[PDB]
Design a protein around this ligand. Structure first.
Ligand code: HEM
Length: 154
């Protein structure tokens, strides 16, 4: 698929807001993913044991991990689709080492959209949410095809 330049503009304009506080956005986003789909917390051997939102809010590794996720996602969105090299290493550890089904990437994509909608209502209107949904579906589609090449899922 392919995003038009104006859709990439809408995506990178919200993202530029998220970047003003990458760690608080990553915390929000992972906590929302783990509240909504608790099974996903199990994939994290270093947090797995956190029992409440309060413990999550208080954990520095969880905050470190959100920052890692968002920074890697922001570097892929800024390529505007030419992200082949950035996805290769990524698709290799998630398929072979961590073992994150595509289903799990769809869930987090949901949690990202939820959080941006809450924090950025003025910059996250329907059109911008459509463009971000599109950019994220494009991410998942290219990752799923890499997974297939590596021997996972597909
Ligand atoms: C937008 C989606 C994602 C991006 C771009 C992303 C990115 C990354 C990156 C850059 C790392 C560190 C380097 C490496 O291990 O590859 C990481 C590690 C990891 N990711 Fe992902 N990831 C995402 C989604 C997921 C999801 C949805 C889950 C699972 C329920 C997941 C679970 C993990 C785990 C378990 C690690 C290891 C944590 C640790 O022990 O340090 N990832 N992720």
């Amino acid at each position: 698929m392919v995003l038009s330049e104006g859709e990439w503009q809408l995506v990178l304009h919200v993202w530029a807001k998220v970047e003003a506080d990458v760690a608080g956005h990553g915390q929000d986003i992972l906590i929302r993913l783990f509240k909504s789909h608790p099974e996903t917390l199990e994939k994290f051997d270093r947090f797995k044991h956190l029992k409440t939102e309060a413990e999550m809010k208080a954990s520095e590794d969880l905050k470190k991990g959100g920052v890692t996720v968002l920074t890697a996602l922001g570097a892929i969105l800024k390529k505007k689709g030419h992200h082949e090299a950035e996805l290769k290493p990524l698709a290799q550890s998630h398929a072979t080492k961590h073992k994150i089904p595509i289903k799990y990437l769809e869930f987090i994509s949901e949690a990202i959209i939820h959080v941006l909608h809450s924090r950025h209502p003025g910059n996250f209107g329907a059109d911008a949410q459509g463009a971000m949904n599109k950019a994220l579906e494009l991410f998942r589609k290219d990752i799923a095809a890499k997974y297939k090449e590596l021997g996972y899922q597909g």
